């Protein structure tokens, strides 16, 4: 199987590249940066790395030209590339709101549409997993674009699941709570902050990239044949309520 | 009180212009069309009509430069301008997805940020109502951008309610079900379709613009003092469940 | 019009009694206590006070046999009677859990079923408003029964809305955030508790019974003709998210 | 490891018995009937079978007395026993509404409290899985008690997850869509009703008990360390929206 994973240079998407490579998949890795993939690019692993700014829809079109010319058509798409602003909403510029939208929502849409197109043409049973967030279900401060983008992606998941259901293409999302990655690593040296995170959820611990990889493994498995349009929350109780 | 209302040339937004002018508000009306607003312009009702493509963030910026020069700032913002594609997702182009997002989400974001900036600097207690949709809570076919945009707008509402809560700026959404307007008018002479719409909800009728205007009236009233971050569904039971 | 209001001796249901008497409704008041309703009974306002334990389903059955004999069938039902435990779940007894369920869920169910039976017989357009809670959408500590009961009542509201929609019987719920009543009075003299409440929501205030009464007023109005199966959150932003 | 599974005689619960015995768990099976479990007791697999009417709370307390004497505390609890009425709500009796509540909500609650009590006393981790339903998230006709009870169980899951999270007791729910079991078997020979079922979801198939077992298997695994308070929908797209 061929799996295409965005966000491959860091955090959850990188954990996925490593995991799926170890399980003998052919991996197409998409990211705007590649410093964490250079070593692997020098090996003979079945890894194709594309350096791509997924905020640029022209660039995504060029990616599918390249993939089609290389006869590479993934079976599975993991939309994990994403960005998060931390900024007072009055200081969030038009261009920055748009940028978050373009990465977190538009790119998943376009990548999903293109893979679905090729699956419908070839009559293949594809699978998409969208990395949303608990911010797709509730708000947080200083994250207007982020929260909007993640709400959007939950909706998109359900919509595309309905759209391609008769073609046996399954589309699901995962909504992580706090996962220790490069995105969130700054939190973990701050005592006050770690205390407040632990206060906002039920388990006295934090997630790791492997917790989300495991979920992905489940959602792409044969055991997930009846799962489509669902959102799986992996958040140590962050969304359960208020305490 | 000054009320800024997008989508003012048609449908819900147009019913709003009429009703609120009738109630002695000063109205700033935004829309890309103005043919229905011309008659009202001929009167000396306190109505400013702006012809503006809200998909162009530069035209929104010019709008607000004009308003600042005129020392005109709204007390209330109704985000009602919206578009809806009906397009099988494999035929939904990058530009069209992004256009729906830019009208349905980015314009409410920018209008909201700009009014809220002026409220925070003046220490005025503002109110924003976003017209989302039941497509902000569930999916529908051939509506990938629409569903994504309406889900986004619901999360944006929650986020901005949170962001501006300490400044006493309330931000709520309304999720209509089927409302007879120029958007949906084509359905109403199709018997097959009308019967399907009625089977998909609880009440044997459809909504009218006035159903949404009355909800807006409540949400901007003093009786809505403790209401923020809420989504008011006005849908004849369309979202209640199945069968 | 006759309006039947449970919880009539205290808090929200008492504020309803007074308000709706003032607008010329005939009121049927249901509560297990009556000390606050005594003054009202002495006047000859059109108020019928019934002292009833709504956790006793046979007493409810008798009430309706009586009401039938007296030709008092309500046109509107407001289910406001409720209780709330604050008990660590390991100390929450079988009986305490069942009682909270019986009062918060079963009583609304039976009352609703009986009023709707009479509307369907008479071909009347009835209206039910269930007072749920934000604890019907998320969890809180030491409130296992309360949370379960309120999630149930949200479900029940949707279900009855669908069941009775073709008969033009509308069924909606209100989910209050923190409303200052006898239920919550103990909180208001604890400063630390009040601070935590306020930082868990958007608005620096709390709700009053009148906030809920005005929402009731809207939902029973003719302007609510297309509203059924909806849950109206009146909560100062408490549910918007975290921070 | 010991797992207690309710509803062990039929459908999902029975599929669990067989599966987890094959995996070397010691299984405490609970059900009001036992005819499908007789054969298993004939082998000497580590299976305790208990005949118990889980609507009877004293019978639950006697169960725990007897397990305490045998020193068998389960490590994992799967609440799968349930019932569903198909009855027009005007014909749904007080007792039948309460019965559905007692089986579908109150028994999960008591079982959960009792296992949690012993996990907290022994300072052992514990894991609960509650079998809710898509009727826990939306309504369906003729199912007032069932929709109520399943909404309640979703809320109870979230609450208990919050309540016991500091003790590392994880509590999650699974919400199946149409699973072919003895509960639903009657539908499958009805051509028209099958066609309506497929029309209401995205995938042209139905679930099997194994689909829910596999979800349980994931929720009780070490890969589920960060999952609590979550609701996993396994429904073929039934909840995605309306088509
Ligand atoms: N870590 C968390 O706590 C958390 C919580 C919930 C959801 N998420 C989501 O998980 C996903 C992955 O997060 P992460 O923690 O691994 O973050 P990360 O920053 O460690 O990795 C994200 C990767 O995405 C890539 N990316 C960003 N913008 C891109 C662009 N324009 N083009 C191509 N690649 C781009 C980044 O360069 C980076 O390598 C994101 O969508 C994030 O919003 C994370
Ligand atoms: N009518 C329904 O059944 C229904 C259901 C749910 C939600 N809604 C929403 O309600 C809102 C109003 O819908 P309506 O039914 O009144 O539709 P409408 O088409 O009658 O009115 C929409 C107006 O918005 C304006 N508009 C669109 N694009 C714009 C642009 N780029 N710049 C400026 N103005 C623009 C249009 O010119 C038009 O006058 C929309 O957001 C719509 O999605 C409608
Ligand atoms: N006040 C809040 O902050 C808040 C928040 C959310 C929801 N609610 C809900 O609003 C509703 C009204 O609450 P309130 O604040 O007015 O509480 P309150 O305690 O002041 O009034 C509730 C009334 O219901 C009656 N009641 C209780 N059990 C009864 C029984 N067995 N039979 C008859 N009457 C019975 C009580 O006697 C009392 O008069 C409740 O369902 C409650 O859960 C309140
Ligand atoms: N099958 C579906 O399509 C579906 C969909 C959503 C949720 N569910 C839920 O999944 C769970 C399992 O359902 P299933 O399809 O296996 O049903 P089933 O009828 O096949 O099995 C239910 C079992 O629960 C037991 N039970 C019922 N009442 C009991 C009592 N008072 N005490 C002890 N045992 C009792 C029954 O005897 C039976 O063995 C239920 O909670 C059901 O509501 C099923």
Q: How far apart are alpha carbons D71 and D56 in whole angstroms?
A: 23
Method: X-ray
**In sequence order, what are the residues at sequence separation of 6 or more whose Cβ sits closer than 8 angstroms to the Cβ of residue A159?**
B89, B139, B140, B141, B143, B144, B147, B148, D240, D241
Which residues of chain A lie closer than 8 angstroms to D165, CB-CB?
Answer: 201-204, 236-237, 240
User: 């051509």: which residue's tokens?
Assistant: D191
Torsion A153-A157-A162-A167 (CA) sign: positive
Provide the 10 A C-beta neighbour count for residue B221.
13
Chain A: nearest CA to B42, how far in angstroms? 35
In chain D, which residue's Cα lies nearest the Cα of B193? D243
Strand order of the β-sheet with D2-6 is: D47-51, D26-31, D2-6, D76-79, D126-131, D169-176, D231-234
| Residue A147 to residue C238, Cβ atoms within 8 A | no
Provide the 10 A C-beta neighbour count for residue C121.
10
Chain C: nearest CA to A176, how far in angstroms? 15
Q: How far apart are alpha carbons C161 and C128 in whole angstroms?
A: 9
Name the β-bridge partners of B47. B27
Q: How far apart are alpha carbons D219 and D230 in whole angstroms?
A: 10
| Residue C150 to residue D155, Cβ atoms within 8 A | yes
Which residues of chain A lie closer than 8 angstroms to D240, CB-CB?
Answer: 158-159, 161-162, 228-229
Q: Number of C-alpha atoms within 13 angstroms, CB side, residue D239?
A: 26
What is the D159 CA–ligand 1 centroid distance (Å)?
30
Q: How far is CA A67 from the centre of its chain?
A: 20
| Residue C57 to residue D90, Cβ atoms within 8 A | no
> What is the phi/psi pair of residue D96, to 5°?
-70, -40
3-state secondary structure of C182: coil
* Resolution, angstroms, 1 dp: 1.9
Instruction: Report domain extents, chain C.
Output: 1-243
Which residues of chain A lie closer than 8 angstroms to B164, CB-CB?
Answer: 89
Q: Whose CA is nearest to atom 12 of ligand 1?
A: A80
What region does D241 belong to: left with phi over 0, alpha with psi -120 to 50, or beta? left
Q: How far apart are alpha carbons B58 and D72 in whole angstroms?
A: 70
Q: How far apart are alpha carbons D167 and D125 in whole angstroms?
A: 7
The torsion of the CA quartet D47, D52, D55, D57, rounded to 10 degrees, works out to -90
Task: Say yes or no: A43 contacts chain C, CB-CB below 8 A.
Answer: no
Q: How far apart are the first and last CA of chain A?
A: 44
Chain A: nearest CA to D227, how far in angstroms? 5
Q: How far apart are alpha carbons C83 and C65 in whole angstroms?
A: 26
Name the β-bridge partners of B2. B26
B54 pocket-lining for ligand 2 (C-beta < 6 Å): yes
| Residue A240 to residue D223, Cβ atoms within 8 A | no
> What is the phi/psi pair of residue D137, to 5°?
-120, -20
Task: Say yes or no: B34 contacts chain C, CB-CB below 8 A.
Answer: no
- Per the annotation, the verdict on C19 as an active-site residue is no
Catalytic residue (one of A19, A40, A146, A218): A146
Task: Supply the DSSP string of D228-243, one letter for each residue.
Answer: -S-EEEESTTTTSB--
In chain A, which residue's Cα lies nearest the Cα of B149? A152
Determine contact, residues B148/A161, Cβ cutoff 8 Å: no
Task: Say yes or no: B128 contacts chain A, CB-CB below 8 A.
Answer: no
| Residue C166 to residue B214, Cβ atoms within 8 A | no
- In this complex, the chains that touch A, judged by 3 or more CB pairs closer than 8 A, are B, C, D
If residue A145 lies in a helix (H) or strand (E), which one and from where to where?
helix A144-163
Task: Say yes or no: B116 contacts chain A, CB-CB below 8 A.
Answer: yes
What is the C22 CA–ligand 3 centroid distance (Å)?
22
Task: Say yes or no: D156 contacts chain C, CB-CB below 8 A.
Answer: yes
Which residues of chain A lie closer than 8 angstroms to D198, CB-CB?
Answer: none
Taking the CA of residue A79 as reference, the ligand 1 atom at the shortest distance is 41
Task: Say yes or no: C87 contacts chain B, CB-CB below 8 A.
Answer: no
Q: How far apart are alpha carbons C125 and C119 in whole angstroms?
A: 7
| Residue B155 to residue A153, Cβ atoms within 8 A | no
Task: Supply the DSSP string of A192-243, one letter for each residue.
Answer: HHHHHHHHTSSSSS-B-HHHHHHHHHHHTSGGGTT--S-EEEESTTTTSB--
Which residues of chain D lie closer than 8 angstroms to C158, CB-CB?
Answer: 138-139, 147
> What is the phi/psi pair of residue C226, to 5°?
-105, 15
Which DSSP symbol is given to C155? H
Length of chain D: 243
> What is the phi/psi pair of residue D22, to 5°?
-50, -25
Q: How far apart are alpha carbons C179 and C12 in whole angstroms?
A: 8
């Amino acid at each position: 199987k061929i799996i295409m994973i965005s966000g491959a240079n860091s955090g959850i998407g990188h954990a996925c590249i490593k995991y799926f490579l170890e399980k003998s998949f052919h991996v197409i890795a998409l990211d705007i940066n590649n410093n964490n993939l250079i070593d692997y690019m020098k090996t003979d692993m079945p890894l194709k790395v594309v350096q791509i700014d997924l905020s640029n829809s022209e660039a995504i079109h060029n990616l599918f030209t390249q993939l089609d010319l290389e006869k590479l058509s993934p079976d599975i798409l993991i939309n994990a590339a994403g960005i998060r602003e931390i900024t007072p909403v009055l200081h969030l510029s038009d261009d920055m709101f748009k940028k978050v939208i373009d990465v977190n929502l538009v790119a998943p849409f376009i990548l999903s549409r293109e893979v679905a197109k090729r699956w419908c043409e070839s009559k293949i049973k594809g699978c998409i997993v969208n990395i949303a967030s608990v911010s797709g279900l509730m708000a947080k401060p200083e994250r207007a674009a982020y929260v909007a983008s993640k709400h959007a992606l939950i909706g998109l998941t359900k919509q595309m699941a309905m759209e391609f259901g008769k073609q046996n293409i399954r589309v699901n999302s995962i909504s992580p709570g706090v996962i220790r990655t490069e995105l969130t690593e700054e939190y973990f040296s701050n005592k006050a902050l770690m205390s407040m995170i632990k206060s906002n959820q039920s388990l006295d611990t934090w997630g790791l990239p492997q917790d989300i990889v495991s979920c992905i493994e489940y959602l792409i498995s044969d055991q997930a044949r009846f799962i489509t349009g669902s959102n799986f929350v992996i958040d140590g109780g962050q969304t359960a309520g208020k305490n």
